[model samples]
Target: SGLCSDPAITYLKRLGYNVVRLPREGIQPLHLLGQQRGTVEYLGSLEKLITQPPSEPPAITRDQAAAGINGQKTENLSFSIGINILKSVLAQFGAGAGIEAQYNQARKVRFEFSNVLADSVEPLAVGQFLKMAEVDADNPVLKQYVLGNGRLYVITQVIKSNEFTVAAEKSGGGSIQLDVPEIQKVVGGKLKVEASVSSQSTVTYKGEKQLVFGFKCFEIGVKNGEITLFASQIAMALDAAGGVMPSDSALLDEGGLLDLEGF
Candidate 1:
């Protein structure tokens, strides 16, 4: 029978010897031949395979799983390999091909900013409009103001004023004044003058208050005024720490005020 079925021959094979007879237990030509063949193969393949084993499932560590095989640790091995390949290809063509390829890559990520409103001041409001402008000028009677939003309007009187003024002719004389026609006509016992007016206001970004200037529309009459600021669905962005964070270095450095138009 063959060695596969013969118990005696199998016993010899399991004892570190071939399934053949030997003159002595310690000496066998077949065993010597197998060792010689293994040594030759190991030597021939050692430089390519023996120094480091290929990555395998059970051998991988927990830290390797956390860092990712291609992450920063492992010396960014995959990135280094990719960079080396790119450099070699670029070197083959000198500088011209490299520059053109870089330019094309840049085009994929570049972006631009545009202004919705051009550099022109437009009519802001009529009388009864809420004072949405951030600042006031010296002329109390003749108001020269700009509303943050572009609307056309008049100021009949100061509905609410933050500025201090002294005038014996009107009640609450020291407060900022609005041109309330009924109050003026009834108190002063005279017909009030209605003036055709145009005003402009500059909108500036306020970092401390974090309020961007804007416009509130209104309706005016010879004797009364009403605010219509909320009637329109205007796009606007309000200032907030999350929306306009100070740590946003790029936006902050670009003078962080954005117009309410197109939000």
Candidate 2:
């Protein structure tokens, strides 16, 4: 009847678009000048629009078309059909940088599909622009889809810890204990202190300053009073024929465990 019984199909064909009416009820072909054609469904009642020239072409809103299609025929058709066609094409493939410029040119009717533009055009509508911006920002992996022209950009931040201190005191012959509160004040929380003791000058028993000690180094534990030694410490202790000890040995080995049992 009118082009292909479907208003959109007829409208497209009149505009020099070669369309193929499909066997399917709603589907119809779209042939863009110079590009591969694809099929899409008519969004509205294409049959009704085709049967009767719309009182006025559809507008952005219903009120704009109240006068009918007689005097404002082109405007009505531009809004209802032209914009619909352009929007459909954009929605199909406009988000990425690769195809946007071409999409824009095609919409503007400046570039045919055959000689596709080198890049994608930035979306002009507020909603389309926002959608593209949000997609690019939310997905770092999708940055490639965003154009290099700063149409969209992503932001990110990272954090790291600062340095702190640790201290300890010998509690017994084979034990050492740390001041938990003082360590927390400097380090912001519980920390482990590595204790190392040696004969001050390696003299015979009690000949020199036999007791010399220092913290080899220490690491802050996630929780209070948790300590673990590295392989090097075990080797050092074995070589010296004496093992390293906890400064708070009694508090940690027996008192701490017993108190926890009550809990």
Candidate 3:
């Protein structure tokens, strides 16, 4: 219908994909300069664009590249997961026991997951793979770590998580060694994740290409069952204003134009 309103949205749309808000009644903020905010629409759209881009997409602008470097392209997203199961595992291994239990608790709450694929394996696409595995409250896995109410935790980081092996030395001539399995679980919770696809890595595993992806959380919160907005003073100020208004604190464009011919 109308031309793209926000400059960020314009950039994303020009990259060759339709971006629309999820059918939820709430205010969705856009990620702007120095603003650590974004919406599910942008996140979902960017996921599609990055993984399955158009045959001929728009060129990446210097501003976007810079934003990627500054870690400013964050967007809010929700996922279904086995909350208690992971908690049980984390509690025993790191969070519950050990001298650094406090630190481990903080680290485990980030909800790190791995082995996210960008292509279809057998029949499940990336989205489908997630859709088929969302755990529910009735799930026995959550019986032990039950909360007072059905609260959703907000995870702010969404960065790729890597795998590593663990080994314990023994007095004898042997050691206990094991490789940690992929930890993929999250649903019915909000997550503020980075939308910048500047770090997507590709590897040929088992004679097939695998596009590994993830998000690192910087903030986290919890709330009883309800739809609400994340904390953002700038977003509140912008929403208070009737229309788009320029800020005096806005910075001037450093580099005018990029050398496209060189590319």
Per-residue lDDT of candidate 3, residues 20-97 (tens digit):
221111111111111122211112222221233323322222111212222212111111122232333333222322
* lDDT, model 2, position 84: 40
Which ranges in model 2 have alpha carbons more than 4 Å from their true place?
1-77, 94-263
TM-score of 3: 0.17
Clash count, candidate 1: 17
Error of 3 at 143 (Å): 36
State the local distance difference test value for candidate 3: 0.21
lDDT tens digits, residue span 91-138, model 1: 322212232232221111111111111111111221112322222333
Error of 2 at 175 (Å): 89
TM-score computed on alpha carbons, candidate 1: 0.13
Tens-digit lDDT track of model 2 for 208-262: 1111110011111111111111112111211122432322111111111110110
- The true-structure Cα RMSD of candidate 3 reads 20.6
lDDT of each: 0.19, 0.19, 0.21
lDDT of 2 at 10: 31
Could you tell me every candidate's TM-score relative to the true structure?
0.13, 0.14, 0.17
The TM-score of candidate 2 is: 0.14
RMSD of 2: 41.3
